[PDB]
Subunit: 142 residues, 4 copies
């Protein structure tokens, strides 16, 4: 099994306050499950080669997704911003597979990624444990 | 908009204790979002014709999904039990659409449904507010 | 240290639906802390001789407390029903100590307790692991 | 009645990550209740003249309390840092009343408060809606 534990940091009240509105798990590698403990979020997966997505909404209406997973035994991440209401995590998560338009991002196996949304919100995923089967990352909103 | 608010009742400790491991929203009708308040769960959707799925896991390892949505202005529900780990909610939710194998169940527009899993766990969805745009249901595990 | 992990089972929608409104920890035995994981609640305490209280409110307005702790190396519990709004858990938890009016209930060291409230709600605390430092109990509202 | 709704912003992973370990409500003004919705926390109180406390623990072991309430129709707040394990919120909340050692801090009726702890964690409470019965504040750990 692989697990990825996420801690969510929100830095700037001027950007609003984000909460989870959806959590998906892709079906490769015997799937996996999201759980919550002590304010953290863990994605537990059956092996290397799958992922899951958290979609967040802010109290100012902004919609963004955070994807984390393991690709060929190395962690990966992505953040997609500027989402329309119909672009749910259920739409987004499969786009990383089957030659979909985000596959290249999974293939990068990034240990960190940073994006600013068109409305001006910074998002970062930064893995703090970057190797092994019990991975850890901070997800930072600003 | 349509909303469906769920209250989860668990009746029989001998069946174990269930917690949410995944939540999806289908992309029709401008999608929608899951939220939590006072121990309840609300699916808020952009109109009639979409749905979302909660997947639960028990502390005894059982995996089941609860689907709720609105079809032609009437509520519907379904429960799928006996799931394998790879049969995530991301796999299940689309099976209600595009002529998938569960579409017929959505089309029934049920206000209640009951199933017992092969391992012996009863599940019921019972709508307590069955009309209008602010729907309410109890989800009962036993 | 001692821990008590609680699983809350709500059985009967006719009683309404309860959520937590307060959680206290008494200061003996170097105090302790509440945490949440996978839908469960754990009170971790620095030794034998302290306790904590969860107060619940139903969506019908009912207020009740559940107390759990360890007294002379044995678990104890209590459920107080029919509470007025001014009788917060901060009022109730100290009543088990300093010769207060509920000390005798702590001294019973009960592994199970059953009480039905003035409005008809049945409450049960039943320890499923009843000995040792890693205690477990089901809290059932029926 | 008065309510105070809190949004918790954790800014700086270098301080570790905090989660709630206790929530108390003082018994004046007919008491009150904590609730959670969309990642936020609301204390609802029966009138002016009471308060509640959230205690937080970081994954580095740091213990701090945040107190919010209404005193003579104006909001107040406090943050106490450097707490020992025996100094639970049940100990701290009453210290603002009955001529206790923190009463003067309640009497200040602060709309903002900033303090840095012995281990270097910055804490700010800043009310964003500072008048009326539906108060709002950001709690920032930095
Ligand atoms: C070892 C690894 O990460 N492999 C990745 C693939 O994962 C495998 O996918 C298959 C289905 O094709 C099956 O579910 C296996 O259990 C799973 O490990 C897959 O994610 C591909 C996608 O391009 O990348 C790797 O090869
Ligand atoms: C009114 C209604 O419930 N219609 C259902 C359909 O929903 C519509 O679906 C389209 C896409 O085809 C679009 O997303 C609309 O916004 C949405 O209302 C759809 O769910 C079908 C599935 O067979 O059933 C109804 O017709
Ligand atoms: C061993 C045990 O459970 N003792 C109980 C007492 O707990 C002790 O209390 C003192 C303070 O007086 C101190 O906090 C110790 O750490 C703690 O173990 C206490 O709960 C009394 C209450 O009557 O019962 C036992 O003696
Ligand atoms: C109006 C107001 O905020 N009054 C504060 C007091 O609150 C009152 O307290 C009494 C009990 O003495 C009772 O519970 C009332 O309902 C409540 O409004 C109290 O907090 C004092 C503390 O010094 O300050 C104000 O007077």
């Amino acid at each position: 099994t692989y697990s990825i534990t996420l801690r969510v940091f929100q830095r700037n009240p001027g950007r609003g306050f984000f909460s989870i509105v959806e959590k998906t798990v892709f079906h490769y590698a015997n799937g996996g499950t999201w759980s919550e403990a002590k304010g953290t979020h863990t994605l537990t997966m059956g092996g290397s080669g799958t992922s899951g997505v958290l979609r967040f909404m802010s109290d100012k209406g902004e919609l963004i997704t955070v994807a984390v997973g393991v690709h060929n035994y190395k962690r990966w991440c992505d953040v997609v911003t500027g989402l329309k209401p119909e672009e749910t995590a259920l739409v987004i998560n499969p786009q990383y597979y089957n030659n979909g338009p985000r596959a290249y991002t999974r293939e990068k196996q990034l240990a960190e990624y940073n994006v600013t949304s068109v409305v001006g919100t910074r998002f970062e995923v930064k893995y703090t444990v970057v190797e092994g089967n019990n991975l850890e990352a901070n997800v930072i909103f600003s």
